[PDB]
């Protein structure tokens, strides 16, 4: 039911909010001005001009806003009652998808997936193994299979003294942000696209249950482990992100010298052939302009194809029977796969990227060990100094799992500069 999916409800609301009577734009406005989003300006994208996480978020938001606007147009033309009595507009869908896409990278720890694996391995085989017997199975699982999507949900909606609900985003935006509406256990029960990872920690189970019950998400789990169907706009958000990750990593790889210019045309002829102006392409004198020209065309065709795919399986998506992505139903699957493999071989496996990941591991391991050692023995002078350096903000009487997840969130959201400086101080440099 689309009426419940486009909920304007926020945390702490008592009276129901109706479309015909704050707005989805306000979510984007709040995310833009938020400190965690601003902090993305000092966070890199594990590549050797090259995009930072802030620009990637910006570009993803721009693709998601286009996808959502077209999808809202088509749904409003398919469900007249959504605008006749409920008063919804395609700009609403665009705003929801753009706000969800803008914050999709707000909780990811530095150094890419290597940082996530470092946080996981710290609690699996490192100093964090001591907490295994003091936590429940799902809590420990969250600790060992730490992902930045659950951390991003935590950042977007975590209460603090004087700020309940965090950014207080609308429930539609929160639902679109959740790509994996399931708990930390069981680990990958099936081949469904939404079961690859989890989207919320144990400290957010009640809040996401409230969000799902407000949005009317279908309960797909018959056991005691909660799991819901994906929000239909989460498909658009993820498709936008994949389109950017594919076409823009290739642009960045080509412009940085890691990928020769020939592969650009070689893997973009199929994508851009239907709309390329050959005279304009040949008239361009710089490689950067040509690759930008190709990137714009490819993004446009992929956006249109994703909209067509979404409207092809709307009923299946709303029922929860869709087990793959919108980009997986692409006619350009071979070319997309070839581009992804070439990017993996030339960028992600480059020395510079490997070197950086090896440093992240040592920095994150050191910081996590220092924070945990301070947590266990908060009486020594060195531990008091560590607490002052890394957690001067506040202190409270919380549980062990809450403290550990707070440590993980604080370490994940540090800027590369702040993390490196703290690691050097702790290492006496």
b/e map of 57-74 (b: 16 or more CB within 10 Å)? bbbbbbbbbbbbbbbbbb
* Residue 221 touching its own copies (CB under 8 A): no
Q: Which residue lies nearer to Mg ion by CB, 17 or 197?
A: 197
256 binds its own copies, rule: CB under 8 A? no
Question: Interface with its own copies by CB under 8 A: which range of 47-55, 203-211, 316-324, 364-372?
Answer: 47-55
Q: Give every CB contact of residue 350 below 8 A, 6+ residues apart in sequence.
A: 48, 258
Residue 422 is labelled as binding a ligand? no
Name the binder of 257 from its own copies, Mg ion, none, CB < 5-8 A by kind.
Answer: none
Q: Is 42 in the site for its own copies (CB under 8 A)?
A: yes
388-399: b or e for each residue (b if 16 or more CB lie within 10 Å)? eebbeeeeeeee
Show the DSSP H helices in 135-180 as ranges.
Answer: 137-144, 148-157, 171-177
Which one among 55, 158, 304, 325 touches its own copies, defined by CB under 8 A?
55
Write out the binding residues for its own copies, residues 279-308 only, by CB under 8 A.
Answer: 280-286, 288-289, 292-293, 295-296
Question: What is the spatial distance between Cα 297 and Cα 295, in angstroms, rounded to a whole number?
Answer: 5
**Alpha-carbon gap, residue 122 to 271, rounded angstroms:** 43
What is the CA 188 to chain-centroid distance, rounded?
19
Q: Which of residues 399-428 bind its own copies (CB under 8 A)?
A: 415
């950017």: which residue's tokens?
Answer: 244
Distance separating alpha carbons of residues 85 and 87, to the nearest angstrom: 6
Binding site for Mg ion (CB under 5 A): 241
By CB under 8 A, residue 158 contacts its own copies: no
160 in contact with its own copies (CB under 8 A): yes
Do 349 and 341 form a contact (C-beta atoms < 8 A)?
no
**Gap between the Cα atoms of 64 and 75, Å rounded:** 16
Ligand-binding site membership of 13 (annotated)? no
Q: For residue 387, state whether it binds its own copies (rule: CB under 8 A).
A: no
Convert residues 73-112 into a mask of x (bound to its own copies by CB under 8 A) and - (unbound): ------------------x---------------------
- Of residues 189, 171, 109, the one with CA closest to residue 364: 109
Residues marked as binding for dATP?
29-30, 45, 66, 179-180, 249, 295, 348
Q: Which residues bind its own copies (CB under 8 A)?
A: 25, 28-29, 32-33, 35, 38-39, 41-42, 49, 51-52, 54-55, 58-59, 62, 65-66, 69, 91, 160-163, 280-286, 288-289, 292-293, 295-296, 393-394, 415
Residues marked as binding for dGTP?
45-46, 53, 149, 179, 197, 249, 348, 357
Residues marked as binding for Mn(2+)?
56, 104-105, 241
């Amino acid at each position: 039911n689309w009426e419940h999916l486009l909920s304007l409800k926020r945390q702490g609301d008592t009276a129901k909010r109706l479309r015909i009577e704050l707005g989805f734009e306000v979510d984007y406005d709040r995310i833009i001005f938020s400190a965690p989003f601003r902090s993305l300006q000092d966070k890199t994208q594990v590549i050797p001009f090259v995009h930072t996480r802030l620009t990637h978020s910006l570009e993803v938001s721009v693709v998601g806003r286009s996808l959502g606007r077209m999808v809202g147009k088509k749904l409003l033309e398919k469900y007249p009652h959504l605008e006749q009595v409920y008063g919804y507009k395609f700009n609403d869908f665009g705003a929801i998808v753009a706000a969800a896409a803008l914050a999709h990278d707000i909780g990811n720890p530095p150094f890419g997936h290597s940082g996530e694996k470092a946080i996981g391995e710290f609690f699996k085989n490192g100093y964090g193994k001591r907490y295994k017997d003091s936590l429940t199975a799902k809590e420990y699982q969250d600790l060992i299979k730490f992902e930045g999507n659950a951390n991003g949900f935590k950042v977007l909606s975590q209460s603090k003294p004087g700020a309940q609900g965090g950014l207080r985003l609308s429930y539609a935006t929160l639902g679109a942000f959740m790509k994996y509406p399931k708990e930390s256990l069981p680990h990958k029960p099936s081949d469904h696209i939404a079961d690859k990872k989890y989207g919320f920690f144990q400290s957010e189970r009640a809040l996401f249950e409230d969000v799902a019950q407000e949005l009317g998400l279908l309960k797909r789990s018959t056991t005691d482990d909660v799991s819901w169907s994906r929000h239909p706009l989460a498909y658009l958000v993820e498709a936008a992100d994949d389109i950017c990750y594919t076409i823009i990593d290739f642009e960045d790889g080509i412009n940085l010298g890691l990928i020769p210019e020939e592969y650009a045309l070689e893997y973009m002829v199929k994508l851009v052939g239907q709309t390329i102006d050959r005279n304009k392409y040949n008239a361009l004198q710089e490689t950067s302009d040509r690759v930008s020209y190709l990137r714009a065309l490819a993004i446009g065709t992929l956006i249109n194809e994703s909209v067509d795919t979404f409207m092809k399986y709307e009923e299946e998506i709303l029922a929860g029977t869709f087990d793959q992505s919108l980009i997986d139903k692409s006619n350009y699957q071979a070319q997309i796969t070839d581009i992804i493999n070439l990017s993996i071989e030339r960028i992600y496996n480059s020395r510079e990227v490997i070197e950086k990941e090896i440093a992240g591991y040592e920095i994150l391991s050191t910081l996590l060990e220092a924070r945990c050692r301070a947590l266990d023995n908060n009486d020594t002078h060195y531990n008091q100094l560590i607490q002052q350096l890394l957690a001067p903000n506040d202190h409270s009487e919380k549980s062990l799992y809450e403290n550990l997840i707070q440590i993980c969130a604080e370490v994940s959201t540090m800027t590369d500069g702040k993390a490196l400086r703290n690691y050097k101080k702790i290492k006496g440099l």
